[PDB]
């Protein structure tokens, strides 16, 4: 996030870090319940990748985080690699997450909800803070 | 060039499809929602992450970090996957797996 600020530790409990074999963060995701994470289809997540929950600092060693393995990956069949439309993939964890104060779920809207233009929302992540 | 160790957050406004198309044109498809273009920008490593808006006092996943300015311009619209357009697919997947 370019021009964002540091979040309060544990304040966005659904935010997860998607890492690969080497533990390299390549994408983020959101917990919608204890066993499902919604991410982007272009991230190219596999069963070999690991979902990390309850995290804030990645250079840390003390945080009680949960490194949950992925058992199933479900990329939206309608995902278009050229238009990038339907850019959503669902992850089912092999081992379910243990909810706490720093690990919980985000609400999902109804297909009929209208979040009008102008609405200030929030985006979170460990992405580049400067291109 | 700077990747953070600590989680970052950023407030950003939702944009109309029309307003967004004024820049991205026909690239903006039905399952996409634009936000940003206001001084902040999601960037490499943010993909898959959440774009939340608090519906009824609770943070609701309205968007998923997808694509945008290749240089992460804080002045161009950021494109996120529209969850309202994908929510039923989500539900249907949970209900069958």
């Amino acid at each position: 996030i370019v021009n964002g600020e540091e979040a309060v530790p544990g304040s966005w409990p659904w935010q997860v870090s998607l890492q690969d074999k080497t533990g390299f963060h390549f994408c983020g995701g959101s917990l919608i319940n204890e066993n499902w994470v919604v991410t982007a289809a272009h991230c190219g997540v596999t069963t070999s990748d690991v979902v990390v929950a309850g995290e804030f600092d990645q250079g840390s060693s003390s945080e009680k985080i949960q490194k949950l393995k992925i058992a199933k990956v479900f990329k939206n069949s309608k995902y278009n690699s050229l238009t990038i439309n339907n850019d959503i993939t669902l992850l089912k964890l092999s081992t379910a997450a243990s909810f706490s104060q720093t690990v919980s779920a985000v609400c999902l809207p109804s297909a009929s909800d209208d979040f009008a233009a102008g609405t200030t929302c929030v985006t979170t992540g460990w992405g580049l803070t400067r291109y | 060039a700077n990747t953070p160790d600590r989680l970052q957050q950023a407030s950003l406004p939702l944009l109309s499809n029309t307003n967004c198309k004024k820049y991205w044109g026909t690239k903006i498809k039905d399952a996409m929602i634009c936000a940003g273009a206001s001084g902040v920008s999601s960037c490499m490593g943010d993909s898959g992450g959440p774009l939340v808006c608090k519906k009824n006092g609770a943070w609701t996943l309205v968007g998923i970090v997808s694509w945008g300015s290749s240089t992460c311009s804080t002045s161009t619209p950021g494109v996120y996957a529209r969850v309202t357009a994908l929510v039923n697919w989500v539900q249907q997947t949970l209900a069958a797996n």
Partner: peptide, 11 residues
């Protein structure tokens, strides 16, 4: 869902 135990503070 959507109500963090640890409240997020924007700005």
């Amino acid at each position: 869902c959507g109500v963090p135990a640890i409240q997020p503070v924007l700005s």
